[PDB]
Design a binder for these strands. Sequence first.
RNA 1: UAAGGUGAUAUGAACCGUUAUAACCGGCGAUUUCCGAAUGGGGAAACCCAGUGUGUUUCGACACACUAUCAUUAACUGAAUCCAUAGGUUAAUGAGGCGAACCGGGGGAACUGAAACAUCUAAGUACCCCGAGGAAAAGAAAUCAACCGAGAUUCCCCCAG
RNA 2: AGGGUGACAGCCCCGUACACAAAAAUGCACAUGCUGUGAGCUCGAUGAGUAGGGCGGGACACGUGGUAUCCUGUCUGAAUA
RNA 3: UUUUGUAUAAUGGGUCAGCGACUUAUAUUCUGUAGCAAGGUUAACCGAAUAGGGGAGCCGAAGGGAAACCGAGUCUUAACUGGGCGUUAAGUUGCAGGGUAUAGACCCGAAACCCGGUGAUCUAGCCAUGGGCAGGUUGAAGGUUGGGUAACACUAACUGGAGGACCGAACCGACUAAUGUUGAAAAAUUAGCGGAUGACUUGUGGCUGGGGGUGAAAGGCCAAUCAAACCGGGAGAUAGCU
RNA 4: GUUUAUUAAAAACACAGCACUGUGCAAACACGAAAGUGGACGUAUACGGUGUGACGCCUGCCCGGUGCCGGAAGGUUAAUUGAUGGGGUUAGCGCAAGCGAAGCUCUUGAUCGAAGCCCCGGUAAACGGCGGCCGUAACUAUAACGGUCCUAAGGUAGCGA
RNA 5: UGAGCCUUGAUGUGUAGGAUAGGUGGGAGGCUUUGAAGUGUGGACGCCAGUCUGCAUGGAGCCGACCUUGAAAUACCACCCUUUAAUGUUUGAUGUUCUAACGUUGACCCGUAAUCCGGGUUGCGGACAGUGUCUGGUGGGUAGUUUGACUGGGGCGGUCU
RNA 6: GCUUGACUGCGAGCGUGACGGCGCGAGCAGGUGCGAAAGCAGGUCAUAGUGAUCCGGUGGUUCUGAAUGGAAGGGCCAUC
Lengths: 77, 50
Amino acid sequence: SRVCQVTGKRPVTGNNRSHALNATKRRFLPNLHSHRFWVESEKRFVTLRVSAKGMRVIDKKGIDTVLAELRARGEKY
Amino acid sequence: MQVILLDKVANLGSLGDQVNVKAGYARNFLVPQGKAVPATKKNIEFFEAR
RNA sequence: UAAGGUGAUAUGAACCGUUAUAACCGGCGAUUUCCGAAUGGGGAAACCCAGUGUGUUUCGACACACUAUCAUUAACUGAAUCCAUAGGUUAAUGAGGCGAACCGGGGGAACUGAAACAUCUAAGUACCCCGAGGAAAAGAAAUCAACCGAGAUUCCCCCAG
RNA sequence: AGGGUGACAGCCCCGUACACAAAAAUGCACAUGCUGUGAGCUCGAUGAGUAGGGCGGGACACGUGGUAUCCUGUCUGAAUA
RNA sequence: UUUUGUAUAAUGGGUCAGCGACUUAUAUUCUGUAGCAAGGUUAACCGAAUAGGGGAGCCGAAGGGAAACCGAGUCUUAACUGGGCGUUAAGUUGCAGGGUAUAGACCCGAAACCCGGUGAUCUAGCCAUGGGCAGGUUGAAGGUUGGGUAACACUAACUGGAGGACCGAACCGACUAAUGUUGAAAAAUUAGCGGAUGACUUGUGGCUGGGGGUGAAAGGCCAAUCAAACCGGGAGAUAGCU
RNA sequence: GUUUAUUAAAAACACAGCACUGUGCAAACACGAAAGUGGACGUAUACGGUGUGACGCCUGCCCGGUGCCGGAAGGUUAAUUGAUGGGGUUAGCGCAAGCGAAGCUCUUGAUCGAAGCCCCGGUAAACGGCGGCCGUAACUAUAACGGUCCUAAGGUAGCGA
RNA sequence: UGAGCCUUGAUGUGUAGGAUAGGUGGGAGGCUUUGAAGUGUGGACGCCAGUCUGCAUGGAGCCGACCUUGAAAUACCACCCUUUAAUGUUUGAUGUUCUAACGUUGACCCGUAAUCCGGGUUGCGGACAGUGUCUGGUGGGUAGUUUGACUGGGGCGGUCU
RNA sequence: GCUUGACUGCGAGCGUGACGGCGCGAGCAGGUGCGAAAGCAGGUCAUAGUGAUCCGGUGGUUCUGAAUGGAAGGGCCAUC
């Protein structure tokens, strides 16, 4: 699925409002990338399906603090 | 951003410097390989004591 | 509780019981074949084919028991690779499925109305999908009010077409 | 009340009003026991990729309009009684 | 019934019986009736439960102006001889009815649109595994020998058995005519006809699903149907039409 | 050979051949939100698209228009970048006529800016065009031939009654 | 290489004029033995008009309304504008190299006698490609619709105030 | 020749339309032009020379100003 693993951001729907205001259904896809992260505590390259905002969150919190949040809600990594 | 150096780094480093670095040179080279740490104003006293 | 009774179409046959174990009704159990979440592997559902363990005045053949997947926890083993992890085995507990409405959430039309039609309307309606409960949801103010104050949320009547 | 008994039954019959009953299982109440959970006072602490903003949308009766408020796909980004 | 007009050869009815079409809810206006009266009247709820309690609120006795504002006056204008709208008319709550509004809105009837499912046992193409093609005819490449050539060419029998080859059963297809047209048959029969060793035909199983499939291309086929299958749902879609 | 099962079996469709164009393999293209598969377990003597339809003689003229292929000095040009200008608010200053700091906010949008388009050059086995107007000269008279119309060019071969 | 920013140095010929005067400010003494004018050259700018200054000869001075200029000083001390140069910081653009993101449908090892996938090593690409959001062009491939009425039937022509 | 009545605020009453509207109008109030004066002028001899509404643009009017003081916006008058 196209679900961000860190921030939990999922694709939502929307409308393509034209010049004549014609409504057409579409989706809002996140800027997801499969980035390979390194951790010191486990000594392993850990790949994660993260977004562009997800990389911004994981820099401030830390690579090990975010994995504590995946540990609490039972996610796999 | 604001990372502080820790090693025998080339000509921007003197074993700890507050520099203005880009995010792409920060991670995957200076974050977790060694040699740097993000300055979140908690680690600025923690690793200088080390 | 009882002098009747063995459900019905449905008689008949052969019997039971009449002062307390006939029948009837209620509570708690016992039994509960096969299929079906089906759960030992498969399968054209009610069928086929095994593994391990246990048993013979007849140790052939048969009978009894267990063996699904996933999740957490614990133990034992265990790569590339040194440590370590991935992985594998076993055990305990839990989940699975069905069900008419109600609740929350993820998606979501068109006919039609606009006397046509594209904004709009129909409408977040029908439907689909997921999850949970006896209700759910919401819920103790970064809410309203206007210089006076009120003191969470929900529901009903007004304000008001 | 009602129904039945050979045509219309208060007094024929089942019931009705009323008066009673539980070996066993179970529901709701109070009383007590048991094991964890946590009271009360003082001194603090105050929830950051968050509020807010650009672009693109959605939700508030309110169709972006002079449009507040709420939600966020994208890009950024505070203050600390 | 519909029409300017129907005995009309215009529409509808074989008959009989049963069934079948102006409703309901909530608002608003008008009339009739009834209560109270410058007042009338409650809604939820409570309840000695159709009582009573509850006056939240609605409507009326005051209007004018876009409005502030002013007020039996007000607006317009610098101000009106004036002028426009008002003052000098009792409303309000029930009940029944005539209307309108929102709802399917007197009843029956579309062609189609959208969503969720069900079907390739018929047919179109394809995949995998098997089967069928009696009989006869034409005699290719290649091969051998002889003739022939300076040597090849060329040629003669013999040998060989090629072909979306020829004729013709099974089998497959459907060109013409008759019969058939409430048929024996919701496309067939009889007699002629095309292919019939191939781009053939056929059994069994598999795959491709609806705005999609497939199509040696007709806009054909997709369960007796296809210029967008079937079923269920939105749906009592809508109809200024009969 | 194939086709309108069930009113049209053909002059239709298909066909080997020919030609153009795309495609260097993780190919073009296609089914798919994606993964993945087909293409193909193939590699330009290969594959996909398009038109023509054995063979024999052949396939002329025209690039203006429309398409495609490139080329690019300039013109025009989105998101973005927010330079200036205008307005609101008010600390202060002025008995007031007014003006107005900083901060915040409304609004205006110079500069930067790609493809595209205009522009420049090719390409007809690309879609297409292959025309008029006047004047003669053996029996009809041809159109050999001579001017004009600059819209890019005016029927070559062969066939036609 | 285009721009800001920071020290450091140059830089200013309307014209009269001791002379290639930058403007405002303090300003009638500062500077020179912490070694001066005035001569002699190198480097250099440039409208070759001239000027600055290292080194060096030199061995004790030069200035101010000085009269002229629309504005007076290389008497000194300040923040600086015009233009320009070189270090240094900052922000972009262009080109090369490199690896650590990322791509691998190259090879090998293990989970695992497994064609997927996951982990590891290594090779080759490499901040490109591709994706997300925003945005210009293209787009019957697809979707919703429109394409009027009177009319001696309709259409053609014509009309609508 | 001189000139701005191609004035502003109103307007009894009437014609004419289903309506929206359109057309005529003496007279009054204010301030003018011309004539000595009585007087006349609210466009052209009359009848064609036209467009509702919505959304806005501009100027004026503190009319309104979602806590107050403003402001944005809305409205009114003029007008596109």
